[PDB]
Amino acid sequence: AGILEMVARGWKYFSGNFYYFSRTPKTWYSAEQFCISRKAHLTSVSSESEQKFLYKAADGIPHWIGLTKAGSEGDWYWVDQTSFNKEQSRRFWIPGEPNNAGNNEHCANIRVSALKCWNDGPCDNTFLFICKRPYV
């Protein structure tokens, strides 16, 4: 509906997209349910620059993003259905990650504040979250 309005409504703006950083923590799925109801999806990271903005604006607090496995034993996909670049992700996971700790880590979160900031963790962990919505 327009940049100023969306900004004025509390949304962040970075490079062709609106973002919503949740004021309360939810499980990955309850976070996605909210983003759908906000005409959005849990965020994707489709560049290094977008990764830079997203870790910065997270403020060192662990934020759910929109990476999830296609089934508890499947490969990662972006929920917003953009392509997942397996190779580009190398520069985005915290070293050691994805580690699949206790074989119950199928949802990914911005845990720290660096270029390498993603951690795989339990999908039922409650964290703050980022809804992504196109500027269309």
Site residues (CB under 8 A) for its own copies? 27-30, 33-38, 68-74, 106, 122-124
Q: Which of 58, 78, 62 is nearest to 70 (CA)?
A: 78
- Residue 95 has which token pair? 């070293």
Question: Could you tell me how many residues make up the chain?
Answer: 136
Count the neighbouring beta carbons within 10 Å of the beta carbon of residue 8: 9
What is the nearest approach in angstroms of Ca ion to the Cβ of residue 91?
A: 17
- Span 60-119, contacts to Ca ion by CB under 5 A: 97, 99, 101, 105, 119
State the binding partner of 99 from its own copies, Ca ion, none, CB within 5 to 8 A by kind: Ca ion
Asked if 17 is part of the footprint of Ca ion (rule: CB under 5 A), the reply reads no
Count the neighbouring beta carbons within 10 Å of the beta carbon of residue 22: 17
Output 38 or 116, the one with its CB closest to its own copies: 38
Output 35 or 128, the one with its CB closest to its own copies: 35
What is the nearest approach in angstroms of its own copies to the Cβ of residue 11?
A: 17
Output 43 or 51, the one with its CB closest to its own copies: 43
State the binding partner of 124 from its own copies, Ca ion, none, CB within 5 to 8 A by kind: its own copies
Whole-angstrom Cα distance, residue 62 to residue 7?
23
State the binding partner of 109 from Ca ion, its own copies, none, CB within 5 to 8 A by kind: none
Dihedral angle at the C-alpha atoms of 48, 53, 56, 62, nearest 10 degrees? -80
Whole-angstrom Cα distance, residue 26 to residue 43?
15
